[PDB]
């Protein structure tokens, strides 16, 4: 989420410069966290980009790439089928 966070500010750098981060602790990524809602001021419906910042969205796999269950239950599927050809036609 640090590195998202970074991405964020990277976009934006040039409406205010981001602050240092360098010999930084992984979770005092809340500087980062902090300056992105500054950042935020400078610009049309911001309630989705602050989303984004305070609440990222995230989605934790105990398992490890679980690819190859998603690519079998696809495959089997016959709708998953029908829904991949309709994609590509």
């Known amino acids: 989420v640090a590195r998202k966070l ?6 934006w750098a040039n409406y205010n410069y981001p602050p240092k981060v360098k010999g930084m602790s992984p ?24 989303r984004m910042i305070i609440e990222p969205k995230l989605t934790a796999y105990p398992s490890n790439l679980l690819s190859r269950k998603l ?11 029908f829904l991949i050809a309709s994609y590509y036609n």
């Not at 970074?6 to 976009?11: E, G």
């Not at 300056?35 to 049309?44: A, D, G, N, P, R």
């Not at 690519?71 to 089928?81: F, H, K, M, P, V």
């Open 6 to 11: 970074s991405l964020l500010a990277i976009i």
């Open 71 to 81: 690519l079998n239950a696809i495959r089997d599927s016959e709708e998953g089928q």
């Open 27 to 50: 979770e005092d990524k809340c500087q980062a966290l902090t300056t992105h809602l500054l950042q935020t001021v400078e610009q049309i419906e911001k309630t989705n980009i602050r």
